[PDB]
Amino acid sequence: HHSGLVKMSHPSGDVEACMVQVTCGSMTLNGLWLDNTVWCPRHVMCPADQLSDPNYDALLISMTNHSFSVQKHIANLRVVGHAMQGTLLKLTVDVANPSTPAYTFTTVKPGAAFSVLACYNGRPTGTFTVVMRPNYTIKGSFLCGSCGSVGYTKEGSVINFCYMHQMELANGTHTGSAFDGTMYGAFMDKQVHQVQLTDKYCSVNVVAWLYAAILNGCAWFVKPNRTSVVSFNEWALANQFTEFVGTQSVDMLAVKTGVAIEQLLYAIQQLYTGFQGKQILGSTMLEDEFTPEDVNMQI
Amino acid sequence: HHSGLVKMSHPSGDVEACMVQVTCGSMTLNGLWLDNTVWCPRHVMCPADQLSDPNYDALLISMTNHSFSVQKHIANLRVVGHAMQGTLLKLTVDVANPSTPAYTFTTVKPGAAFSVLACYNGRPTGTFTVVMRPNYTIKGSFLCGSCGSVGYTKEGSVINFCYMHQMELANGTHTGSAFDGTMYGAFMDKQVHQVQLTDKYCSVNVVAWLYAAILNGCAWFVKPNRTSVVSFNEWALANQFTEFVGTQSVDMLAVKTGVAIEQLLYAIQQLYTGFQGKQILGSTMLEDEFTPEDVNMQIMGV
Ligand SMILES: *[C@H](O)[C@H](C[C@@H]1CCNC1=O)NC(=O)[C@H](CC1CCCCC1)NC(=O)OC1CCC(F)(F)CC1
């Protein structure tokens, strides 16, 4: 029995209408056009010469409004302002985006999922869902020209913008900025080798996934035994798991199933070292990319 | 090394602007509004007590234009005509959808992937990608209210509409209609237990996935040895694989890597038994849900 638990993205329509192309001299990439503001990565200012260690203060001083050009493919936009905020540019333009959705800015924490609209030359090309990993990188699919693609969640018709794509690490994973301008995971926007920390299992997501299993008729791993939040978090330090942190969302799953979070924490301690011949939701390894909210929504 | 080979859907905005709610008595579901036409599953006509063997032909005659209420959410639309085409209703409305995309109506074949815009009460809520399986079912996530949700691809500026959701089977998979009004597979729009055929591995997609592995620096499974297409296809009949049919998209993966299809058809015959402790792209079994087009786009960008 297919659980129907699949990797699901938000409808991208509201964001597609905000995507523009931004050019600065020879560099071009994607930006996000909200009201009279265009957001893009500041490295649009770098020539190919100096990608190893750009001087962003000197680059910005050297610029005028006329240094930037914004075009819409998904309108006639003139840049009337330019400023830096962390690793992002905040360009001001003269026309307001008529299709600006209600929005907010949020900084996601490890374990949370968000949707990415991948864009090339301001044209949306694909959408996928990613989980912010405990080492503050994401997987997903990003090729040359995708910088400035944005990640977002939704609450109603309210879009919470949370990610603007910046770079790929040598291991093929990715990182970007929040719209407060800080890079996820302290990475520097310099083309200089930087090492991701080790990845961990997102405990709270693993729990949701086993709840999903129980809801689909797979509960052989539920015993009466319990492990406390506090004991489990001590066990997790030593075994490559994140701190467990309960939510209203996870509690709903306990009520639906009759199974308590503590029972699954114990279950995870045992399953960590193997399934011993058994399957769960078609896997032989614990899965940590489905959040509690995914399981509530989809089952 | 992370491949960058992920489940990726088309941007759904072109399709969001076409989704409406269609109501007929008790039943409510989603519809697809293109120009002056609204398409929806015909069982919206069906009263809840008569779902096991509905007489659609008599249900339709009994309706008037006022029996159908159509609401946009993402105005009210006046129904000025109604007709049945196979398992779908074709409603005519007095306003042409001002945001109709260029579109076609092509039925997809097994192994082909498409994007789904899952909707409830005419409100788009999620998008995901599915593969039409050899037994004409799809996986995905569909709950009460999802009927009339649509699946599509986009080629150039043209959206191809290929799926309108109708039902969930006992094993949790799903099926529906093509926009010519046929149901995929044998299925009928009757709420009755129905025999779905045995599933199979999608050979061409397994080859694309092996090519993605080669491109990502993982080719331990490649040997000089080859199996021809005709020989592989005869073997496939006895081992739960589809016939392999090459395409230009696969040929490009072969040109780019230097590895011939026939070397990968040979490899599949050896990897079917198991990988014997190794992995391919973080997998210990063969993956058949990524197409050659996916691999060309996501790894090479074509
Ligand atoms: C922008 O579109 C592009 C996106 C990349 C291309 C491949 N996959 C992606 O996600 N970003 C870059 O190409 C990025 C540009 C530079 C510009 C100067 C400031 C810093 C970013 N370079 C990049 O991602 O290269 C990696 C190399 C390995 C590293 F660890 F050093 C980080 C930078």
Ligand SMILES: *[C@H](O)[C@H](C[C@@H]1CCNC1=O)NC(=O)[C@H](CC1CCCCC1)NC(=O)OC1CCC(F)(F)CC1
């Ligand atoms: C329409 O929105 C709905 C979508 C279903 C509900 C649960 N998941 C889905 O994908 N479709 C139906 O409910 C469908 C309607 C009938 C009405 C007469 C014409 C033919 C289809 N019935 C259906 O899917 O029955 C299933 C329910 C799930 C099951 F496992 F119990 C087997 C029968």
